[PDB]
Amino acid sequence: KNIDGYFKIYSKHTPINLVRDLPQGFSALEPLVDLPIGINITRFQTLL
Amino acid sequence: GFNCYFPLQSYGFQPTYGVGYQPYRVVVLSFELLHAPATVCGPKKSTN
């Protein structure tokens, strides 16, 4: 999420037993970082 | 050429001299605040 010029990241990782379908239940995401980025962000792309 | 010159010339130095000749280094602060989410200030001095 990017708001007020600040970029924020929230995340968590846990094990599962499924393959193609997302797991049910509930799991919150704790914050990770908050940087005063400020750029007029409009798009994104991944890496692998 | 005649009546022509290059304005780029090197500093005139001596081993040591008083005011006027003396190389004195100056630093200038930046422009106005609030233009970005960044922050640059002295420490928020805490007490016991």
* DSSP letters for A1-48: -EETTEEEEEE-----S-SSS---S----EEEEEE-------------
If you count residue pairs, one on A and one on B, with CB atoms under 8 Å apart, how many are there? 12
Q: Tell me the Cα Rg of chain A.
A: 15
Phi-psi region of B7 (alpha: psi -120 to 50; beta: other; left: phi over 0): alpha
Q: How far is B13 from B21, CA to CA, in rounded Å? A: 7
Phi, psi of A9 (to 5 degrees): -130, 135
Q: A-contacting residues of B 4-33, CB under 8 Å? A: none
Q: How far is B34 from chain A (nearest CA, A)?
A: 12
**Which chain A positions have a beta carbon within 8 Å of B38's beta carbon?**
36, 38
Buried b (16+ CB within 10 A) or exposed e, B3-42: eeeeeeeeeeeeeeeeeeeeeeeeeeeeeeeeeeeeeeee
Q: How was this structure determined?
A: cryo-EM
Q: Give how far the C-alpha of residue B41 lies from the chain's centroid of Cα atoms, to the nearest Å.
A: 20
Q: Which of the 8 DSSP states describes residue B12?
A: P
| CA nearest to A7, candidates B37, B39, B41, B33 | B37
Q: Which long-range contacts (CB under 8 A, 24 or more apart) does A12-16 make?
A: none
Resolution of the experimental model in angstroms, please?
3.8
Q: How far is B12 from B28, CA to CA, in rounded Å? A: 24
Q: How far is A31 from A1, CA to CA, in rounded Å? A: 11
Tokens 């994104």 correspond to what residue? A44
